From Swiss-Prot:
The lineage of its organism: Eukaryota, Metazoa, Chordata, Craniata, Vertebrata. This is Cellular tumor antigen p53. The chain holds residues 96 to 290 of 393 of the full protein. Changing residue 46 to S: In sporadic cancers; somatic mutation. Changing residue 62 to I: In sporadic cancers; somatic mutation. Changing residue 186 to Y: In sporadic cancers; somatic mutation. The gene is TP53. It comes from Homo sapiens.
Length: 195
């Protein structure tokens, strides 16, 4: 099967948000609204905001999962390449095979679907704290889009789902990701190409 990627705000008005990091050559993570695409460096922090119109129930969770963007690759589980899954860079919680990790959250759970074999990382949804209007999760992508034996230059999508305590769907959003050496340059190049 293939996880759905349909945008769904649901009852709580759930949707993602991204910082405005610009496209300077040195930027490590930058988001393109025009392409709905995040460009980032290997294993660098990717701040992703969670916005809702109303606070969901206690026990609500947020899951991140990568899938190949191209239909001809959709059924293939997105995983780290043969090199990176063996480079011993685990943080003591993320299995080394997982492409997406969550930083600084001891309650992060890493799932290997016994049915689909797909990987995902889920954390408890936390309401925004005093002074903030949104909640931010910091993700890391652990392979380059170009890694041989892994993504092998195939574009991927990250699907973020708001789930209830049983894993049922409350909301969904998604964005394309390109893990590269120079996000700033790549984003400028791709948006130019789009122009
Ligand atoms: Zn890799």
């Amino acid at each position: 099967s293939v996880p759905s990627q349909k945008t769904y705000q649901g009852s709580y008005g759930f949707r993602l948000g991204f910082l405005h990091s610009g496209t300077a050559k040195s930027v490590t993570c930058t988001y393109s609204p025009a392409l709905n695409k995040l460009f980032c460096q290997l294993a660098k922090t990717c701040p992703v905001q969670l916005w809702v119109d109303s606070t969901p129930p206690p026990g609500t969770r947020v899951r991140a999962m990568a899938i190949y963007k191209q239909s001809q690759h959709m059924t293939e589980v997105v995983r780290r390449c043969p090199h990176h899954e063996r480079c011993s860079d685990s943080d003591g919680l993320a299995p080394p095979q997982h492409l997406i990790r969550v930083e600084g959250n001891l309650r992060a759970e890493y799932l290997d679907d016994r049915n689909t074999f797909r990987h995902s990382v889920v954390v408890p949804y936390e309401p925004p704290e005093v002074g903030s209007d949104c909640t931010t999760i910091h993700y890391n992508y652990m392979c380059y889009s170009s890694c041989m034996g892994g993504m092998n230059r195939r574009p991927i999508l990250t699907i973020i789902t708001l789930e209830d305590s049983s894993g049922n769907l409350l909301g969904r959003d998604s964005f394309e990701v390109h893990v590269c050496a120079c996000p700033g340059r790549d984003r400028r190049t791709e948006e130019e190409n789009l122009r």
